[PDB]
Write a protein that binds this DNA or RNA. Structure first.
Ligand SMILES: C[C@@H]1C[C@@H]([C@H](O)CC2CC(=O)NC(=O)C2)C(=O)[C@@H](C)C1
Lengths: 52, 289, 213, 160
RNA sequence: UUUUUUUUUU
RNA sequence: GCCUCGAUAGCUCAGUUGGGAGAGCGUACGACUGAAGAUCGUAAGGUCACCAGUUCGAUCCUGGUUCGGGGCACCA
RNA sequence: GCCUCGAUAGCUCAGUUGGGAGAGCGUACGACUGAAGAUCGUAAGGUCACCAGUUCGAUCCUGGUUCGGGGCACCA
RNA sequence: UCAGAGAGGACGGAAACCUCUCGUAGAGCAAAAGGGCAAAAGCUUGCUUGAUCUUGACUUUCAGUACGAGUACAGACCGCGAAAGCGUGGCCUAUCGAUCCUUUUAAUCCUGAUUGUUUCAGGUAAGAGGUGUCAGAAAAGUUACCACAGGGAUAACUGGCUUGUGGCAGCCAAGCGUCCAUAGCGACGUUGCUUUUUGAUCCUUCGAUGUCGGCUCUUCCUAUCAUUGCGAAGCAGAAUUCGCC
RNA sequence: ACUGAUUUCUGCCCAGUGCUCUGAAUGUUAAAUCGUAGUAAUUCGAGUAAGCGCGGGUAAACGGCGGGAGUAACUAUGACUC
RNA sequence: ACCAUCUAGUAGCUGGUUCCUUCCGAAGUUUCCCUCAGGAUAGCUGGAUCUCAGGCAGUUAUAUUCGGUAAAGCUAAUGAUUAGAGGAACCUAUUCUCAAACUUUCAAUGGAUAUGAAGUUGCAGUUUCUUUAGUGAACUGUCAACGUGAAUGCGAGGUCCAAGUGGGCCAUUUUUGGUAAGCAGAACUGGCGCUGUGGGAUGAACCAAACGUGGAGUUAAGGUGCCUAACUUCUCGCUCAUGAGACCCCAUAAAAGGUGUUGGUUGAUAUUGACAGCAAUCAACUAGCCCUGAAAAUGGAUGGCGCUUAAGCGAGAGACCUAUACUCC
RNA sequence: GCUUACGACCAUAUCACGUUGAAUGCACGCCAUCCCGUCCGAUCUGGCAAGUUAAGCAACGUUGAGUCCAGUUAGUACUUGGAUCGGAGACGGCCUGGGAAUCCUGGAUGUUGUAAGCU
């Protein structure tokens, strides 16, 4: 009664049934994971620019 | 014996980089000396090349680009005749003068000499260019090449010259002349004397006392130029003053016409004709022997 | 006894050469691959006959040796030991495997079934393709008949179909007889024992003078 | 089942090219990388720090971070029915600028320049669209000194 | 304290 | 029957890529002794079970014949 | 078939992490004895089973090979 | 600058140590294998403790959880270097551990609720003590006296596929057969057939297909022992051998 | 408890496991008790019985009871030896 | 032991689980579990809808890249491995045959990214970051101008709640173990499971084609002597078998033979008359059909009957028949 | 036409042998008081300029080895998709598109940047 039986048979069909969803377009806007020193200077730069 | 350098050897052989085969560039140190942090982007990182040949001292300022280094300033010890000195263009004093010349020349070029005069009184004490006003002093990192970093070596004499001229060269006094490696004490007086060439004058007096013939052999052209052991220090001080007075590069000359002095590569037809002639000559020799 | 050849006839597995991973391999039955007047000069034997294969199978070392013995015996008996040169152009390098099972009554008590069924070395076989040359014989032009009959007798020791042909090439060289004669006249082909070496033009002229071509 | 070490199966992927081992040339370090640029990933075996995972070898990514000697890259990776924009910190030695984006930027520059020139000079607006190669047009072929050569199938010859 | 043997016929 | 193993001098045993047939007992002679026994030395003992083959070359390697010796051989 | 264990003078057995190859009997020599045996004094002796590797050096440590020995081999 | 090679030098030899040439790495890098590396990642040597303190982000496995391992930064204090620089363990890919409990280190910390002091106890943060069945119960047998829920997901008998093994039949001829390959055989090789052997498998049957042999009784197949009709012999005949219908 | 009429016999082993016999035995041992420190909880130390460990007995208690080489005047075998 | 009660004891296991239509419609795979007849987890699926009205795609093009498999190589390294030659080993140049854990070289299929308004040019400000430095990097502005930049197709996106499943099996191609297996294990895709329909006599998977309920027409695969709707239709050959042969999977056949017959290849001789006997012939090959090789058990299978200038084998031609398919109503 | 310093690509640049080398320069070179480092001023370090292109280095030469490029190999090997395609099978061709690599043959033998200088 062997019961390991790995396979990848019906997996691409399942993956494609609802389409392969590509990543969104706003993912490049976030400044997450960027250098802390650069981020600090960006905060300082943004906190001081006069509006008018 | 089995031939080591056979067809397979040459087929599998990989040559080193040209400047490594020529034994001129140490790429391990070059990578750490010329590569700029990627968060500084294209901002040039300036390097002070010091190279002493058998008869000349070369000091240059450069920064690296993807197609070759860009030399921005250069001072050669063979330019010192313009400022007095005619002989001894390789000793400690000449090296220091060349460094000073480079520093003053480039500072004048970029219009910072007035702001940064550097240390204008030779005392031998360690000096670092303190920031004045808003513009920080020009900065360069020393590049000694394949030379050995020993105490009192002339590469650090050139570095000292540049630093006193007023360029920020990150350094410590450990490898300057007069620094006792044992007690970690620095003798500014000894360093000043070496910069002024007192060691050369001392050698002149010592040889004069010991043997006149050896003295003439050693310092033949010094005497021919009239530099004895009682005006050399004054000559070096005058050289320093002249450099600090004027440092602009010498004017260029006109392009003299040039002619071919070497042999030109043979053409394909010429090579084939030589092959035919050699074949005929060899056949004739075979038949006549 | 040996398993019938039909059990290892066709090429089914990847090549399994004897190496640091396949140890304890018994020796191949066939050892001699050049027979007859093997030291004859290149010009001695100008005619060449090949035995090509028409099957993509395994030729066993036993079959190779049997065919060698048959062809050698016939050729020696009908032409003399110095009238021919026979070369076997196939060496047995592939290792076949066997998963030995006990064949007596009550064997199932100890039998492991298919559990851990990886086999152990059994013998050496030569992987052969369509158009591959199995045997070659270089002989004089007045012995092609004997060579062909020898290969005809030998083909009955191999499984499947074999085709005997004659070659336009000079002996064991790679030059068709006409061009071989012409080039040898021009001195572009220097004897190399059984075969010949082409003497390309390029090189130092000091070497060229030793044989102007 | 296979082991799951980082460098399983990379025997040739992470190896140097034939007669290309040794010192890494410095243009690799002189190249300029800015956030938003596209880079190809190709692991250099000679550098074991900041190595990309084998899954990202040969992929293109967009830089989102620029540190002292490395860059953060957003690389698409397919996981079942979604594509994940993974973020990886790769050193400069394993990176190379991608020419696909630069070609497009050059084409955009050319388009803008052509439009500006036409508008300034009063010419009609030009066509600035790539078009698939159309079928060949009509033409005449001359046989002068090019007479047709009659071909026939060749007989079978026994090439022993 | 220990101290076994000595071919056949003559 | 099958897996095998072995066959060497009157008897018992070694031996080899395969490139010589050795040792012992036994037999004949000599030495020794008054004469023997024992002991020594010499001479010695062979188609390498038989046949065919492979090898430049087989006692040894492959196949077959004979002779034997050890094991294996429904079933529920 | 599986799991172990061992291989060392001519025979039977020790031996060290890895830097020694030992013990008894056997063999050879001298002595005591009329002679042998016992006895006394000496000597020489092993394929460390075969290989490859590991470290400075391996009989020993590791792996494989050859031989031998032991245990298991059960339902129905 | 290695491995190695060549040529030299008292004792010195194939091998001790010295010298010169050549030497693309054929060496070494703790270990398996694979990558990588030559003014180094190897060898020699100086100084050292970045194998330290802190939080986030990310990669690998992946559910895009956790551990482990790793990557690139940021803040601190440091080491080496003249400096640029490099350093958060080992050149890279394995070398390891939850909850509860115990224990240690940390704050001039919080709590013990009748008010306080001191012990004592409990907390917050970071480590260690270990689960190798390694996402982590605390664990010896026998049953033929046996029981229950099921299983043809799974063995023992039949049947099925296969045919290694068993059995049977061919092809070439090296030899045997006094001579003579084929009367009769036929080695070394090689092609097949059969399911009366034994294996392999696990397809059907475990809410049951009565599981050896013999006795009895039918029918069938021939791969023919006898008998009918024949052909061939190493067929002069009891006899015998081969083959055919 | 084992054996199992009569007859004739009942060999060797107390290492193992049991059972049993002595105990001077500070070897190991609980509670209680005693002493030290402390303002007290409490801490530390000393004692500390039987057992166990040491010693003896016992198999008609459970049980157990070997290998390898050489060797006799034909061979064979091996009384004999290592 | 028996009697009553706790007790409707627990069961990851077996059995059952009751009306009709309509619409949508799976999985046998990942990870963890004393886990392997079970769960949780992700995936696949349904429902509710909500926000909007061009950016997407199991497809191409352009541009740029990744790889070390097939082939190739060993007269290129490593490892095998035959034979000589030129100066017993050794050196030199060669040579025969090779590698899942060898490689200089290296495809086809394949993978990835980009292809404009979320853009391009400037102007004019911020920064404690960076630089010797407006030097850069980045950001900000109701800043100004420009105006959609490959093909084809097409509306797009978001959230929540939850079922069943977590035994698979088959086939072309690739592929590991095994002598093989209707055996065991994998990769891509398509199927059966869940699925009928025409054909293959019959059959889960084969070929065609997917389905409301009817009709007319036309077909796919398959066929047209009779079973049986559709021709003993038309043309040229080959084949005689004392049970020939007869249509994917597919329902077995080989090595080896034939002076049966039909075509071809090569080499010869022949009219200065070729072979046989006292006007073409000879020899060796080759490949179509036929024949031998070809033995099994209840009586039996091109599906059956039968068929022989076929109703067999091969190349073809007209027409014709027939689906739940296509067109139209 | 050159030399030097620093390079970029990293053999079309390497390797072997040989010829030539104006001027700058590079180099070899002389000395070892001093700094500095060694068993050793050989290397490294320092002070110099008598001498030499001998070597390094540069240019050139060679039917040179290697490397690089191209042709051929060849529409070959291999391969995507199709067939109620041929064949007992192994396999083979056809339709539809992609499409190599050795041997062999021919050619090339560094290009170029910044700075300074010679001519
Ligand atoms: C750290 C390790 C484990 C720990 C302890 O046994 C584990 C616990 C775990 C749990 O949740 N309940 C328990 O009853 C046991 C302990 O004292 C030692 C064995 C060492």
């Amino acid at each position: 009664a062997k019961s390991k039986n790995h396979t990848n048979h019906n997996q691409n069909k399942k993956a494609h049934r609802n389409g392969i969803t590509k990543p969104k377009k706003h993912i490049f806007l976030s400044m997450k994971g960027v250098d802390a020193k650069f981020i600090k200077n960006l905060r300082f730069s943004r906190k001081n620019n006069k509006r008018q | 014996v089995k031939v080591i350098k056979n067809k397979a050897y040459f087929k599998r052989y990989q040559v080193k980089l040209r400047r490594r085969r020529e034994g001129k560039t140490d790429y391990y140190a070059r990578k750490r000396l010329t590569v700029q942090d990627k968060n500084k982007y294209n901002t040039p990182k300036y390097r002070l090349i010091v190279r002493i040949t058998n008869k000349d001292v070369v000091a240059q300022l450069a920064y690296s680009k993807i197609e070759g280094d860009v030399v921005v300033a250069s001072a050669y010890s063979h330019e010192l005749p313009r400022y007095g000195l005619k002989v001894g263009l390789t000793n400690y004093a000449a090296a220091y003068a060349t460094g000073l010349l480079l520093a003053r020349r480039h500072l004048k070029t970029i219009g910072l000499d007035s702001t940064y005069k550097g240390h204008e009184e030779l005392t031998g004490e360690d000096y670092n260019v303190e920031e004045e006003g808003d513009r920080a002093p020009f900065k360069a990192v020393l590049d000694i090449g394949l030379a050995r970093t020993t105490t009192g070596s002339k590469i650090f004499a050139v570095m000292k010259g540049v630093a006193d001229g007023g360029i920020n060269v990150p350094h410590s006094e450990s490898r300057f002349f007069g620094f006792d490696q044992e007690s970690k004490e620095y003798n500014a007086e000894a360093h000043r004397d070496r910069i002024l060439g007192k060691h050369v004058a001392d050698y002149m007096t010592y040889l004069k006392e010991e043997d006149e013939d050896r003295y003439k052999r050693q310092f033949s052209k010094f005497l021919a130029a009239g530099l004895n052991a009682d005006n050399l220090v004054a000559t070096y001080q005058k050289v320093h003053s002249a450099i600090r007075a004027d440092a602009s590069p010498a004017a260029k000359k006109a392009a003299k016409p040039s002619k071919r002095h070497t042999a030109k590569r043979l053409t394909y037809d010429e090579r084939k004709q030589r092959v035919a002639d050699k074949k005929a000559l060899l056949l004739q020799l075979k038949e006549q022997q | 006894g040996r398993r019938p050849a039909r059990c290892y006839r066709y090429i089914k597995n990847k090549p399994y050469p004897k190496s640091r991973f396949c140890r304890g391999v018994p020796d191949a039955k066939i050892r001699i691959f050049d027979l007859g007047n093997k030291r004859a000069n290149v010009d001695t034997f100008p005619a060449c006959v090949h035995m090509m294969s028409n099957e993509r199978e395994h030729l066993s070392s036993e079959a190779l040796e049997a065919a060698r013995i048959c062809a050698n015996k016939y050729m020696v008996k009908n032409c003399g030991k110095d009238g021919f040169h026979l070369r076997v152009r196939k060496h047995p390098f592939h290792v076949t495997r066997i998963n030995k099972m006990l064949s007596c009554a009550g064997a199932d008590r100890l039998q492991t079934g298919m559990r851990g069924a990886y086999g152990k070395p059994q013998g050496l076989v030569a992987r052969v393709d369509i158009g591959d040359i199995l045997f070659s014989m270089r002989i004089k032009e007045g012995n092609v008949k004997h060579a062909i009959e020898a290969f005809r007798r030998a083909k009955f020791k191999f499984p499947g179909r074999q085709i005997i042909v004659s070659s336009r090439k000079w002996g064991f060289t790679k030059w068709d007889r006409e061009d071989y004669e012409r080039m040898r006249a021009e001195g572009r082909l220097r004897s190399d024992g059984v075969g010949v070496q082409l003497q390309r033009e390029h090189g130092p002229l000091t070497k060229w003078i030793e044989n102007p071509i | 089942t296979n082991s799951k070490g980082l460098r399983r199966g990379t025997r040739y992927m992470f190896a140097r090219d034939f007669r290309k081992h040794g010192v890494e040339h410095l243009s690799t370090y002189y190249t300029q990388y800015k956030r938003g640029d596209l880079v190809d990933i190709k692991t250099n075996g000679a550098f074991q720090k900041g190595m990309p995972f084998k899954a990202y070898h040969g992929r293109t990514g967009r830089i989102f971070n620029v540190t002292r000697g490395a860059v953060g890259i957003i690389v698409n990776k397919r996981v079942r029915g979604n594509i994940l924009p993974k973020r990886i910190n790769i050193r400069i030695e394993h990176i190379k600028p991608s020419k696909c984006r630069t070609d497009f930027l050059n084409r955009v520059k050319s388009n803008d320049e052509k439009r500006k020139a036409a508008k300034s000079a009063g010419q009609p607006v030009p066509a600035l669209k790539r078009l698939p190669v159309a079928p060949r047009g009509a033409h005449t072929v001359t046989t002068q000194n090019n007479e047709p050569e009659l071909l026939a199938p060749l007989r079978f010859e026994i090439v022993a």
